[PDB]
Design a protein around this ligand. Structure first.
Ligand SMILES: NC(=O)c1ccc[n+]([C@@H]2O[C@H](COP(=O)([O-])OP(=O)(O)OC[C@H]3O[C@@H](n4cnc5c(N)ncnc54)[C@H](OP(=O)(O)O)[C@@H]3O)[C@@H](O)[C@H]2O)c1
Ligand SMILES: CCc1nc(N)nc(N)c1C#C[C@@H](C)c1cc2c(c(-c3ccc(C(=O)O)cc3)c1)OCO2
Length: 157
């Protein structure tokens, strides 16, 4: 299975200055639950924002840089290499990879952050005409999680 995994706001903002625009611990938990034991594919800038590979899953970084070789990270140099990866593969970001892959993936795990943030990077537009809502779950708010959010699993029609 090839899936997108993304958090985007009401206007599809996903990033600002190579960081997440919001702080939302429950969404990190969400990512942890979905991707532990599986594979994340991410663009080079996304990897650099994190700085080190995420624990307990395969980290794959797409870059044109043949000098790229990071401990704990597998490198690919082409989109076509993604299709060779075994198991459940999550396209993890950022804007450029999402734009390249949204017409290719089987499904999308989207956390809709229900606010309007300043962004410089965006998830591409999509229509529910092409995507069935497998599930939609309102996130729980508390002291540590103060922005409303919804977990969507969308499957290509
Ligand atoms: N909210 C979320 O769910 C979420 C998730 C992930 C990322 N983000 C955000 O997204 C933003 C970054 O997105 P971005 O588009 O600027 O960067 P990006 O997609 O993470 O990285 C782009 C880089 O990936 C490499 N690349 C992409 N396609 C390639 C291809 N076909 N062949 C070879 N290399 C390829 C290139 O690296 P080289 O230039 O090294 O060749 C390119 O410069 C950040 O703000 C980050 O915080 C948000
Ligand atoms: C948690 C953010 C997020 N949510 C959703 N729904 N999809 C995504 N693709 C990303 C993402 C991402 C990258 C940019 C990112 C940025 C971070 C992160 C992480 C991150 C760190 C740890 C774990 C984990 O332990 O599983 C997961 C994501 C991941 O920590 C704070 O800054």
């Amino acid at each position: 299975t090839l899936s997108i995994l993304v958090a985007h706001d009401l206007q599809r903002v996903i990033g600002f200055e190579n960081q997440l625009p919001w702080h939302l611990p429950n969404d990190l938990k969400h990512v942890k639950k979905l991707s532990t034991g599986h594979t994340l594919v991410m663009g080079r800038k996304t990897f650099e924002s994190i700085g080190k590979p995420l624990p307990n899953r395969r980290n794959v970084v797409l870059t044109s840089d043949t000098s790229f070789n990071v401990e704990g990270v597998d490198v690919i140099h082409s989109i076509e290499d993604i299709y060779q990866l075994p198991g459940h593969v999550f396209i993890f970001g950022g804007q450029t990879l999402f734009e390249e892959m949204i017409d290719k993936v089987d499904d999308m795990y989207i956390t809709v952050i229900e606010g309007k943030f300043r962004g410089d990077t965006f998830f591409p537009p999509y229509t529910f005409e092409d995507w069935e809502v497998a599930s939609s779950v309102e996130g729980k708010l508390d002291e540590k999680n103060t922005i409303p959010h919804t977990f969507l699993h969308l499957i290509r029609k």
